[PDB]
Amino acid sequence: PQVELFVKAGSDGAKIGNCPFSQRLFMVLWLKGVTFNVTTVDTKRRTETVQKLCPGGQLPFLLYGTEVHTDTNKIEEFLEAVLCPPRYPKLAALNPESNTAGLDIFAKFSAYIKNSNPALNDNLEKGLLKALKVLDNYLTSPLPEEVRKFLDGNELTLADCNLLPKLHIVQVVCKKYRGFTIPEAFRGVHRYLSNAYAREEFASTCPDDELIELAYEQVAKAL
């Protein structure tokens, strides 16, 4: 059953654009081991064929055989279910908590980078740091095997596929527009990212820095 993921086209209208939802799904298909294609979509020049497949224009979406699936949480719940052992690994996390550690980081990041207000900047900065801190604590707090590279153990899971693309954007945009870096004293967070960038599943599905940045340029205002 041919699998095809349709994603955000970058600036030239051809290559892979900035979007943590497309990367997340790219990462899952990769981890699933299935054969699949990725097809970029310029939303300001949509092909005839895409309007037929996906009238609503939602992106990303998944052509599974003849079925169209929209909404990133659904597309992933669908893949995890239908691409399943023995032929394909189960990717879901075993600890419910892996699925929520850090979930708040992105929202605090967005609030922080969109803010033009100099007076609020230290609250927002500090908000982001505490959220990173909670993640750092979940990452160093031993999981129910004890006598670890990623959120839920030593294998990449759905939880990482969701969190990693968002973390990447956070790092890359905060560096560029705010001179902000994740403190080195979050060792748990920094081994996690070192381990993540060492895996091609994550490394190879990252949009280039220059694309991540360009996309947040209108939004990210100086103080």
Q: Which of 3, 21, 1 is nearest to 63 (CA)?
A: 3
Are residues 115 and 200 both part of a single domain? yes
List, in sequence order, the alpha helices (H) in the chain.
20-32, 48-53, 72-82, 105-114, 121-140, 158-178, 187-197, 200-203, 209-215
> How far apart are the C-alpha atoms of 43 and 67, rounded to whole Å?
21
> How far apart are the C-alpha atoms of 47 and 222, rounded to whole Å?
38
Number of structural domains, the chain?
Answer: 2
Q: Tell me how the structure was determined.
A: X-ray
> How far apart are the C-alpha atoms of 221 and 223, rounded to whole Å?
7
Resolution limit, Å: 2.5
Backbone angles phi, psi at 197, to 5 degrees: -70, -25
Q: Mark which of 92, 124, 139 sits at the end of a domain.
A: 92
Instruction: Identify the CATH number of the domain in which residue 160 sits.
Output: 1.20.1050.10
For the chain, the farthest-separated pair of C-alpha atoms sits apart, in whole angstroms, at 58
Q: Cis link prior to 183 (omega < 30° from 0)?
A: no
**Is 84 marked as binding a ligand?**
no
Per the structure, the complete domain to which residue 100 belongs is given by 93-223
SS3 116: coil
DSSP conformation class of 207: P
Q: Mark which of 92, 110, 128 sits at the end of a domain.
A: 92
SS3 7: strand
